[PDB]
Amino acid sequence: FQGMASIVFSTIGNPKGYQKVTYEIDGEKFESNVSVLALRDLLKVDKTVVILGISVADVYNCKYADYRSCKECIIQNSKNDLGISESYVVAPNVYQKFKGKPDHYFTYIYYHSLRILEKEGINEVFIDTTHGINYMGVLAKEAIQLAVSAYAAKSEKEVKVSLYNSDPVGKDVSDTVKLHEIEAIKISPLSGLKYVTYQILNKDKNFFNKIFSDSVNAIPRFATALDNGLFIYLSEKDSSLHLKRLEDDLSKDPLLTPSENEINVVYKDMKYALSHALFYVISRFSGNVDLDTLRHYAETYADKVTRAIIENEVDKIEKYQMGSERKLLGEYMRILYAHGGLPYAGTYVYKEKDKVYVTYGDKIDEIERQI
Amino acid sequence: FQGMASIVFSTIGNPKGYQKVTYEIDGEKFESNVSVLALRDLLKVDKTVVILGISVADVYNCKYADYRSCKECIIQNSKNDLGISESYVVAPNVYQKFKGKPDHYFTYIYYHSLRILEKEGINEVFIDTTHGINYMGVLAKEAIQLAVSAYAAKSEKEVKVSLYNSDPVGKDVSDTVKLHEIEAIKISPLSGLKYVTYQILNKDKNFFNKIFSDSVNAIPRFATALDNGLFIYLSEKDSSLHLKRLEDDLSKDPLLTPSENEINVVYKDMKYALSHALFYVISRFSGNVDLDTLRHYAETYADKVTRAIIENEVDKIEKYQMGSERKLLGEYMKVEGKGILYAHGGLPYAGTYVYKEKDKVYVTYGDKIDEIERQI
Ligand SMILES: [Mg+2]
Numbered sequence: 251f252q253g254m255a256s257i258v259f260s261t262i263g264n265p266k267g268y269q270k271v272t273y274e275i276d277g278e279k280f281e282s283n284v285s286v287l288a289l290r291d292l293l294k295v296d297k298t299v300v301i302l303g304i305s306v307a308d309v310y311n312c313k314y315a316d317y318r319s320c321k322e323c324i325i326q327n328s329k330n331d332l333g334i335s336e337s338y339v340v341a342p343n344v345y346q347k348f349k350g351k352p353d354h355y356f357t358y359i360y361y362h363s364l365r366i367l368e369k370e371g372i373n374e375v376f377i378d379t380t381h382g383i384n385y386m387g388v389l390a391k392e393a394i395q396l397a398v399s400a401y402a403a404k405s406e407k408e409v410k411v412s413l414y415n416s417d418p419v420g421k422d423v424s425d426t427v428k429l430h431e432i433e434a435i436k437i438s439p440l441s442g443l444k445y446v447t448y449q450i451l452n453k454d455k456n457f458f459n460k461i462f463s464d465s466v467n468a469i470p471r472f473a474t475a476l477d478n479g480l481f482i483y484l485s486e487k488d489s490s491l492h493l494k495r496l497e498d499d500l501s502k503d504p505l506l507t508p509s510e511n512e513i514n515v516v517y518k519d520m521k522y523a524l525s526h527a528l529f530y531v532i533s534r535f536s537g538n539v540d541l542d543t544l545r546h547y548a549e550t551y552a553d554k555v556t557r558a559i560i561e562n563e564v565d566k567i568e569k570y571q572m573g574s575e576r577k578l579l580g581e582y583m584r585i586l587y588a589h590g591g592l593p594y595a596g597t598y599v600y601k602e603k604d605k606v607y608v609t610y611g612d613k614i615d616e617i618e619r620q621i
Numbered sequence: 622f623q624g625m626a627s628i629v630f631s632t633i634g635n636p637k638g639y640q641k642v643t644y645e646i647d648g649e650k651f652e653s654n655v656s657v658l659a660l661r662d663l664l665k666v667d668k669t670v671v672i673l674g675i676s677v678a679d680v681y682n683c684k685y686a687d688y689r690s691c692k693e694c695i696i697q698n699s700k701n702d703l704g705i706s707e708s709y710v711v712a713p714n715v716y717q718k719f720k721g722k723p724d725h726y727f728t729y730i731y732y733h734s735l736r737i738l739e740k741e742g743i744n745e746v747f748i749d750t751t752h753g754i755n756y757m758g759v760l761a762k763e764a765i766q767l768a769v770s771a772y773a774a775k776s777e778k779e780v781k782v783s784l785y786n787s788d789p790v791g792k793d794v795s796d797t798v799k800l801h802e803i804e805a806i807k808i809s810p811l812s813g814l815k816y817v818t819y820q821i822l823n824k825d826k827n828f829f830n831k832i833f834s835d836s837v838n839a840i841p842r843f844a845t846a847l848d849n850g851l852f853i854y855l856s857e858k859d860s861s862l863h864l865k866r867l868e869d870d871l872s873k874d875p876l877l878t879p880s881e882n883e884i885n886v887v888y889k890d891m892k893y894a895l896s897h898a899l900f901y902v903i904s905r906f907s908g909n910v911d912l913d914t915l916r917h918y919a920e921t922y923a924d925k926v927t928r929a930i931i932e933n934e935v936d937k938i939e940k941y942q943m944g945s946e947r948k949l950l951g952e953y954m955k956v957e958g959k960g961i962l963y964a965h966g967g968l969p970y971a972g973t974y975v976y977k978e979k980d981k982v983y984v985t986y987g988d989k990i991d992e993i994e995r996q997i
């Protein structure tokens with residue numbers, strides 16, 4: 251299954267909803283107490299996701315026994331006020347007595363929105379920030395962008411993403427409130443990959459520390475390999491454990507710990523979201539690399555020069571009749587990169603029944619050092 | 622996983638290959654003994670499928686013990702001559718001493734190409750008929766079109782399909798040969814659905830006989846439900862048995878039986894391919910129909926009027942707070958005292974129940990399904 255479903259994510263600052271207003275797109279109108287229901291109606295959006303901060307517990311006198319029971323109380327009460335039965339993402343946020351780190355909101359939305367994209371078979375995403383307050387809008391937008399980027403690359407599909415906002419404040423039903431398309435982008439597997447790597451490669455040298463042993467070095471290295479089309483490396487240098495550990499890290503509930511005067515909320519720093527997106531995209535490349543798979547990777551996941559270099563190397567390999575035993579490419583015909591990841595002294599080739607494979611074999615440590 | 626892989630299917634009449642020529646697309650050239658290798662190079666196509674007839678068995682002195690062994694001899698010997706290691710579809714065909722029914726070639730290509738599409742995560746398909754002979758081109762093109770139609774609708778994705786043919790060289794030795802895009806189409810889930818139903822609904826009254834009990838009526842009836850957006854009916858009237866039995870029928874090898882100077886080949890009549898496509902598409906609609914699922918079905922699998930009527934009825938339903946006990950739509954929406962299926966886009970008020978469970982509102986025909994079925 252593949253899927254062409256649409257979804258709208260909406261940042262809602264007040265789970266009680268808002269004064270009824272008449273929203274409008276292209277002259278067509280829909281009256282609502284929340285912009286997201288108007289976007290859903292006017293754009294015929296399949297799925298709805300309301301994003302709330304844990305801080306709105308205060309509105310309903312929800313208890314702080316633990317994050318899960320607190321968020322369940324929020325959802326039960328908001329469903330009745332908003333007339334939206336599902337789905338809800340209730341994220342760690344900083345607001346009044348609720349204390350923490352704003353980037354934790356980002357991490358949480360990235361991870362939870364990614365899971366939703368997987369489940370829903372999505373090809374079009376709307377992000378409605380009409381009712382967001384403080385930093386909700388900027389961080390939900392960027393966290394969802396990251397999730398759609400990871401999703402498009404791993405699922406190998408195109409996903410359209412649009413940012414919407416309106417201004418219903420101090421208006422009523424006699425007011426017409428336009429829902430504006432602010433920006434619309436198309437994310438392809440290539441541009442999803444490039445966004446994910448971009449978010450690793452523009453961070454300071456210590457940014458990815460304490461994620462796993464030597465993560466401070468391993469993470470930017472894996473990102474550089476992904477960014478430059480080193481598919482054989484992504485296939486052969488196992489990162490499945492890193493991915494599993496990050497899933498474990500992000501799957502656990504935030505901690506809610508009440509003070510005298512405060513509720514402290516602890517989730518995971520942004521570096522965990524960026525790292526997960528990286529290893530999630532890398533998981534696309536698992537398994538042995540035969541020539542047609544590599545041709546496809548070149549077309550799908552490499553920029554134009556890198557694609558051309560890889561395809562030229564493959565063209566050269568396809569001129570020869572290939573045997574069962576493994577030989578270095580040299581035996582048939584900056585160096586790592588000038589040959590698009592197939593340097594002749596550092597890559598083997600072999601034929602196993604109907605496929606020719608390229609592998610670094612026991613030379614992978616040499617390759618790793620040149621990344 | 623979804624996928625944006627490309628694939629070319631090539632009808633090849635002679636597994637020995639052809640006079641080498643320089644194929645060209647848009648000024649760019651590639652010399653080959655087979656058009657499909659030039660297409661693969663010039664259009665950077667991920668996957669290659671060579672379609673051969675079983676009749677090429679004699680080229681390599683292949684034995685006729687059974688279809689599997691004959692096909693495997695053909696494939697192993699063709700690989701070296703053609704320079705293509707995989708994949709091969711070796712189909713029943715009629716030619717010279719090989720006798721049978723030409724539509725069996727269609728059925729075989731449909732089913733086997735469909736399996737290949739599923740495995741390969743495809744969004745772009747090329748059909749190269751350059752080296753096809755007799756009816757290979759017409760039947761491969763139409764069989765593949767049906768396959769992609771079924772695949773697009775069931776997987777819910779768009780697929781582009783293009784028919785290519787080189788300049789025919791005839792009995793001459795040309796030097797440069799253009800590879801022409803003849804036809805290029807885009808198949809959406811809706812376009813796939815409509816092509817599948819079209820192939821059912823343009824057949825004679827008895828065309829679908831002997832597939833399963835009362836299939837002459839049941840098949841057209843399912844196609845009519847699908848063609849007209851009766852998604853609740855498709856969700857509630859079983860067709861998984863029909864799908865399973867068709868997949869079992871089609872997965873069995875063709876029968877090859879040599880006689881005095883003839884080899885008779887038997888596969889399955891075209892009706893099995895068309896019926897398989899139908900039930901494969903219908904299998905998309907499994908599960909209870911909650912209103913968001915229905916809205917999605919209207920947006921994805923229904924023509925403009927049907928989409929509008931369904932969405933209108935859903936808009937009305939969504940005004941109400943829904944209880945957990947099943948009630949007819951009319952119990953919510955119609956007064957006591959006086960005041961049909963298609964005018965309500967499949968949600969007639971006296972024949973459809975509604976209820977809410979675990980955050981979703983559902984519509985179902987429940988015990989009224991027979992009455993709905995009478996009206997299809
Ligand atoms: Mg949540």
Ligand SMILES: [Mg+2]
Pocket residue numbers: 692709710711712733
């Ligand atoms: Mg075959």
